[PDB]
Amino acid sequence: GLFGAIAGFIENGWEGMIDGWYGFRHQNSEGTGQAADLKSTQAAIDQINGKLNRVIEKTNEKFHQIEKEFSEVEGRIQDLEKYVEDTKIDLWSYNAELLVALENQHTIDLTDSEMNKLFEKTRRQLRENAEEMGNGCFKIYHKCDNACIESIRNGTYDHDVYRDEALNNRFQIKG
Amino acid sequence: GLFGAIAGFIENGWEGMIDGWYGFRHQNSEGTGQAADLKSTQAAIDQINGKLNRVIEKTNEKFHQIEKEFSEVEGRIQDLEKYVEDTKIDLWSYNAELLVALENQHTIDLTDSEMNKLFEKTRRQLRENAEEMGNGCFKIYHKCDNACIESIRNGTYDHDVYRDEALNNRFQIKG
Amino acid sequence: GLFGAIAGFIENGWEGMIDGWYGFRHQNSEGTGQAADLKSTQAAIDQINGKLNRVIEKTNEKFHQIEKEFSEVEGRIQDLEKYVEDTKIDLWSYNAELLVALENQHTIDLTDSEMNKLFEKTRRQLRENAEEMGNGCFKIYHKCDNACIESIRNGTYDHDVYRDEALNNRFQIKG
Amino acid sequence: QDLPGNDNSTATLCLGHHAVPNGTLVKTITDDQIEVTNATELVQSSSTGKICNNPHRILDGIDCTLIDALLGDPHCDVFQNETWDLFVERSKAFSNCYPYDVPDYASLRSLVASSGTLEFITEGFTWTGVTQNGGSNACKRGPGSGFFSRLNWLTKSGSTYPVLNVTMPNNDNFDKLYIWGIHHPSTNQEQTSLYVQASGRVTVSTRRSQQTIIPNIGSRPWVRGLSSRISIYWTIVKPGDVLVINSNGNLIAPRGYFKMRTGKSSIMRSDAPIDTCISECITPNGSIPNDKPFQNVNKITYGACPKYVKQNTLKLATGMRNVPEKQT
Amino acid sequence: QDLPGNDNSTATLCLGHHAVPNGTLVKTITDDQIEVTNATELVQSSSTGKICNNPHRILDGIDCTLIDALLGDPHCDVFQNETWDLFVERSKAFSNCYPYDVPDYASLRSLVASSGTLEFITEGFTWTGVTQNGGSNACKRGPGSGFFSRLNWLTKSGSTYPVLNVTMPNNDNFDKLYIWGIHHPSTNQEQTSLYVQASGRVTVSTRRSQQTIIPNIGSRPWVRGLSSRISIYWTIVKPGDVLVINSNGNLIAPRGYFKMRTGKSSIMRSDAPIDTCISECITPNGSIPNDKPFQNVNKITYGACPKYVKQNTLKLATGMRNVPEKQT
Amino acid sequence: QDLPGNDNSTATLCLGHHAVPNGTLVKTITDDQIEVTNATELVQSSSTGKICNNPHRILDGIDCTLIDALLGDPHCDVFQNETWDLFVERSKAFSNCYPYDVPDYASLRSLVASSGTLEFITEGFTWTGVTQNGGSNACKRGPGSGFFSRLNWLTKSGSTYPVLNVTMPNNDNFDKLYIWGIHHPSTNQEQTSLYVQASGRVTVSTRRSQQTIIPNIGSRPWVRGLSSRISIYWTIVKPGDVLVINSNGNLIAPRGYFKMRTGKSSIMRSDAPIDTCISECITPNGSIPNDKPFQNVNKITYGACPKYVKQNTLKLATGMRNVPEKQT
């Protein structure tokens, strides 16, 4: 949608991820693994619930109103009774239809945003030690075991610890 | 608009580009050329048409209704007839006015987004071989002939093929 | 909000900044300093005023209408008079409530965007001479006195002037 | 600084998002079918089929319409002094007493329906010189002739019907609803036989208003053995005001007043069964849950109900776009 | 790889978007004039000026209003048994028969207008003891006197007008609309000359209702040579019910019934020309295309029409912001 | 390029945004309390408590309702030929002349209220054979008996009340409003004493319409010493048409016509004080400023007013999210 991550630079979802809406998949010299990210999953969920709650906020109650079904033909007055109600129904129907349209439109951009915000956040953290492969995967240019991967996910990764290893690997090479 | 590419970091549009809404102009070994990008052009077009179609979706039909123009002065009942219609008209007028306002607002951010998405996509593809000049132009740091330019545009550019050439040119220099 | 700068990668606002809505705080060879950025402050303000003006655009006037408070019990006709007005009031109340909701939602994403646009703009300008610390602060890798900081803020900074100094400092080091 | 010792390698980290095999189509500003991971329905479209008898006070009219219950058709005597939040009128209801018509039936039915009480106070009207308590065989009460319990049919005494001129002050602090009427004879002979005068007249007035109705002689269709009709009228008397009833023939007189109140009561035509359950929203199709914002069951509602909409489904996306690995 | 790949040149690639020299101003949430590449208009604001005679059945009233066409003014005899989806009434229409007034003209015009048929069935009413087929010179039919084709003016026979008491059962499975009326003499002399009784009376009733109208003698303004008037009334008789007409003078009697139906018919006042073309949306200003969602031609519409709005232009941006590269 | 930069240091630049210590909570699509730097209120919720007398022409009714001011109750003679953009009716107003009722009081009050003028033209009606200018002690004008200034009570002359049959052409190019009435005697004796005929009759007609009203004898409640009543009626005569008034007893005759106009006038019931200030929007609670789009003071308005809403506060965020640095 607006940010182009979901159904964008990230090719497709993972039917495999059952423990959260957004997450990580890695392959390092020790193995491969997957893990949901719960902060962004919750951010996306909390916004969607908030939105949902605001829409179910109070059915207003109404008691005696006008008759809306008639069995005799009366003319002028009953035509107005019918017209007041039909123009009321088309107006509320318009509202319902425009409301879910704007809402859904926004719920897709919101979740697209969270996807991209997690991508950016991970980017910023890895500093000069990783490169973006352009499909949502970073190529980390230093030996990163499972504890290293865990620190990137739990947000405590210290880039300085690996920077000379990374920069040597990443640039130097032979050109 | 929200993404700041159109009328933002991209100074102005190209009246010259007639073959599509977004595109590339280059300057290289064999010269200077221009080319529309049809994937983003279509993405922008398809969204705007979808939006357009939803708005022209069904005129609902109405047959016998209430009288709306009167030639005698009658009092209480005719005042209501007039009031039911005038409040119906101001409500639909409100809706029309708010609908095109939200819509237009969104159509500008949508096309701004597609512009920025194509910019990002090209960025990601060039990897360490190009630098952003900050006005929507990349400075490619390796010899890139017309076939090279065409592979960046058709999305098949292999950065590895030029990375040592590029990194040498881009960094080494004398500092 | 959608861009994740305000209350996002930028941890909190500065109660200290009184001269504008967005700005800079630096530390450099000549000491520390703060400064509002007036171009983005104005961009954010102009949009919000425009939005505000469109909402205060014309109260439409109404003169003779229907009676809305009655002292006797009349039956069929007075029930319609009351129903026409009550359904008119709930419809306008719906409108007011949805209007400020959409509006506010957008005003927060708009100002989040301007924050992020200024961040990106500064990024682009510094080129290879600075790194993002990921909290909205760039680490500039060359000696930058107050005039240097002034040129980044007023947008005339020439990265080339410092690029070899910067690249040496930034990469070379010992790995 | 940190010392590598020996290993030289890279790692790959990939960010992504879930996807589900199933997935729901929702409408958008730009698309009208886009598949999302999950959605929730906002249009309530089914009734239980039963009117829950709680929280509101449902009064089932059985085979009485509210107006016959008000007038006091013998078979509706069950409803005297009854009250309701909602009076349900059934398609099967029937009248079975003297043939009547009510000039603005719709207002009287509305007016009583939202008052919500059939509380009747009998007042001491003194009718001098007329025979009281007239009845008819079309309104059998028990084995005998009868008439509406709340109305008093006056006919001549001996050879005279005097000009009745009575008054009843509203000295209480509430409004009083008086239901009265007039008898329309089939023949001039019938007129003179009952009311002596060849032309009756009823004037009922207060300090604020007056109604003078004159009867109309002529044959109407045989309804329960009768071509005559009585038309029903109503007068509300405010506190401090006074009723004056003046007639010279054909008056069907009030026996007292219904007291009026102001509340949330209403009436509903429905053949749905009443059942024991709690439901705030009532629809003539039976109660419906008001958890959803919109409903498509019926435009007629009583209580805290969702807003009626033409649409029967409207799904609010509660998840991201579904972009699965294989297909959908 | 290669060997010393030495060719140290660079390239420049620039991304951008189109711009047009022209460009349209559209409204936004934050701006009310912002220039976009392209826009499309959503308010239809012009009519063709002609009512297309297709797809709906337009009946042109020419110089007949629907009520005269219904009653049977001689000059409107063209319209007998006619039908319409839309009856167009013209500003030039005129009545040219006995002067009449219709107490709730607006309801009768509505009621017939949406029924959409003037189908008339003549029934065998037997009027005994009165002279039938009365006419007037204000309603010339041919060289002679006449009256409304669907009404039957009854006057005395010899020296007497009896009490008419007739009945007509609705034995069919549809509703029957009966139009009847009453004659208001100018002078008491006129009354006795025509109806003998010095005071007439018409009571028309069913099992459900009754109307008793009494005439009113007095001079009204000279209209087509006459100070008298006849007032028109209507009675619908449901299937299974029965009409009883009872009068003792002044009855203008029905000759049968109009049959009622339920459909999409309506009436429109318009002097626009009808033409041969297909158009779904009709406006008294002529047909309009319903491709656009809103229209500003007229708040009176029939058919599938755009929603009337106060605005006369509303442009939906269908392109990006226009930021020209000079502007040529 | 440059020479040895002996020192090679770094700098830090940080981007940020303001925050305020205070800050306001606003509603959103996803949240219903989120704190922003600043907001502005869109619901106007307080009145000044006074009706500003400018820009519209406020007419204060003082102790006259518009209908008594129209009819010409002695105590309302102040209002003759008066005009208004808004007529304010006060809770304290009272009638103090002959007891009357107006069958559709609501339409006549509306009809005059938006016409906005009480301009009265006296016309030369010639009533032959009746005593003119009748009055009553319940309508004292000065020390003596009186009646409504704009109405003329006709009673018999000597031993006769003739059949009045008069006419007044509308020859001007505007519509004429005629207010006329009928007297309802308390007793048949009263009837014959005043109008000779035991049954009066008033027929007022034009080429377009007719009203025939017959009086109703009977006692109503004592109001200002009287049990009689007069009911008020109105007839508009279009340009080119003609009024014919025909009566044989009980006519309360018009003395001329009120002229009608078409404008923005209306009526308002309010006990607010009028004051000197300019305000476009009037509410029965006093004027309110129309700077805000919505208002919650009253659903009754006159002039350029904000749209009434149920909400009493709605804050539009005019600033970013407030994310302050200190604790709470």
Ligand SMILES: *[C@@H]1O[C@H](CO)[C@@H](O[C@@H]2O[C@H](CO)[C@@H](O[C@@H]3O[C@H](CO)[C@@H](O)[C@H](O)[C@@H]3O)[C@H](O)[C@H]2NC(C)=O)[C@H](O)[C@H]1NC(C)=O
């Ligand atoms: C005026 O005309 C009407 C219609 O012709 C007359 O009404 C009919 O009168 C007869 C005699 O009373 C009714 O007959 C009775 O019907 C019931 C049911 O079948 C039956 O139990 C009796 O034995 C008798 O047959 C008939 O129903 C009634 N019809 C209608 C439609 O009302 C009326 O009698 C006439 N009146 C005068 C005074 O001329």
Ligand SMILES: *[C@@H]1O[C@H](CO)[C@@H](O[C@@H]2O[C@H](CO)[C@@H](O[C@@H]3O[C@H](CO)[C@@H](O)[C@H](O)[C@@H]3O)[C@H](O)[C@H]2NC(C)=O)[C@H](O)[C@H]1NC(C)=O
């Ligand atoms: C009651 O008063 C009305 C109004 O004064 C009288 O109406 C007028 O009556 C005369 C005589 O019939 C009408 O005259 C005719 O007018 C036409 C057109 O000008 C002309 O062709 C004839 O030669 C003749 O002059 C006059 O039009 C009519 N005016 C109105 C406004 O109705 C009525 O006659 C009086 N009736 C009685 C019984 O006193």
Ligand SMILES: *[C@@H]1O[C@H](CO)[C@@H](O[C@@H]2O[C@H](CO)[C@@H](O[C@@H]3O[C@H](CO)[C@@H](O)[C@H](O)[C@@H]3O)[C@H](O)[C@H]2NC(C)=O)[C@H](O)[C@H]1NC(C)=O
């Ligand atoms: C018909 O019945 C009504 C109601 O009983 C009679 O009305 C009452 O008539 C008396 C005698 O005129 C009125 O007396 C007046 O009382 C006031 C004080 O309130 C006093 O100031 C007067 O001097 C006079 O005594 C009484 O008010 C009135 N009551 C009502 C409710 O109207 C009426 O007189 C009867 N008429 C006939 C012809 O029988």
Ligand SMILES: CO[C@]1(C(=O)O)C[C@H](OC(C)=O)[C@@H](NC(C)=O)[C@H]([C@H](O)[C@H](O)CO)O1
């Ligand atoms: C047809 O016979 C009855 C009837 O209705 O059954 C008998 C009835 O009295 C008895 C014995 O109950 C009588 N009631 C009175 C008060 O006179 C009525 C009345 O005369 C007509 O209804 C007038 O229209 O007529």
Ligand SMILES: CO[C@]1(C(=O)O)C[C@H](OC(C)=O)[C@@H](NC(C)=O)[C@H]([C@H](O)[C@H](O)CO)O1
């Ligand atoms: C003025 O002369 C006419 C007329 O209207 O032309 C003659 C007409 O009879 C002929 C010859 O057609 C006559 N019709 C009947 C049924 O009596 C009417 C009628 O008496 C008045 O209209 C009552 O108001 O009066």
Ligand SMILES: CO[C@]1(C(=O)O)C[C@H](OC(C)=O)[C@@H](NC(C)=O)[C@H]([C@H](O)[C@H](O)CO)O1
């Ligand atoms: C009760 O006495 C009065 C009255 O109202 O004050 C006296 C009054 O005449 C004088 C002296 O002003 C008289 N007016 C006329 C035109 O007869 C009326 C009238 O007869 C009744 O009101 C009919 O209902 O009765």
Ligand SMILES: *[C@@H]1O[C@H](CO)[C@@H](O)[C@H](O)[C@H]1NC(C)=O
């Ligand atoms: C992050 O991961 C590392 C490796 O598992 C662990 O030592 C560290 O404590 C974790 N920090 C948090 C906050 O979970």
Ligand SMILES: *[C@@H]1O[C@H](CO)[C@@H](O)[C@H](O)[C@H]1NC(C)=O
């Ligand atoms: C991309 O461009 C290169 C150079 O023209 C060409 O060989 C290649 O096949 C192109 N690929 C596609 C998919 O067009």
Ligand SMILES: *[C@@H]1O[C@H](CO)[C@@H](O)[C@H](O)[C@H]1NC(C)=O
């Ligand atoms: C930017 O800052 C530098 C240093 O203060 C100054 O010389 C230069 O002129 C400034 N440019 C502008 C446009 O303010």
Ligand SMILES: *[C@@H]1O[C@H](CO)[C@@H](O)[C@H](O)[C@H]1NC(C)=O
């Ligand atoms: C789909 O959304 C609704 C509303 O948020 C929620 O109750 C339901 O659990 C969701 N479905 C799943 C599988 O999460």
Ligand SMILES: *[C@@H]1O[C@H](CO)[C@@H](O)[C@H](O)[C@H]1NC(C)=O
């Ligand atoms: C109806 O209620 C009133 C008021 O308490 C009482 O006096 C009257 O007798 C009651 N009648 C019946 C039948 O309940």
Ligand SMILES: *[C@@H]1O[C@H](CO)[C@@H](O)[C@H](O)[C@H]1NC(C)=O
């Ligand atoms: C509800 O009742 C109406 C009228 O009885 C019927 O047309 C409608 O389809 C019903 N809908 C449901 C959901 O029961």
Ligand SMILES: *[C@@H]1O[C@H](CO)[C@@H](O)[C@H](O)[C@H]1NC(C)=O
């Ligand atoms: C402008 O938009 C409308 C609707 O999308 C389209 O028909 C028209 O072709 C567009 N104009 C151009 C020049 O593309």
Ligand SMILES: *[C@@H]1O[C@H](CO)[C@@H](O)[C@H](O)[C@H]1NC(C)=O
């Ligand atoms: C009108 O239609 C009916 C029903 O078919 C027919 O009997 C009658 O004679 C028709 N009359 C005319 C004038 O068409």
Ligand SMILES: *[C@@H]1O[C@H](CO)[C@@H](O)[C@H](O)[C@H]1NC(C)=O
């Ligand atoms: C349509 O007709 C009305 C009334 O005839 C007129 O005021 C209006 O301006 C017309 N508009 C158009 C577009 O013809």
Ligand SMILES: *[C@@H]1O[C@H](CO)[C@@H](O)[C@H](O)[C@H]1NC(C)=O
């Ligand atoms: C808050 O917003 C309103 C409307 O934009 C403005 O008048 C006011 O000055 C703002 N407050 C501050 C402190 O800027």
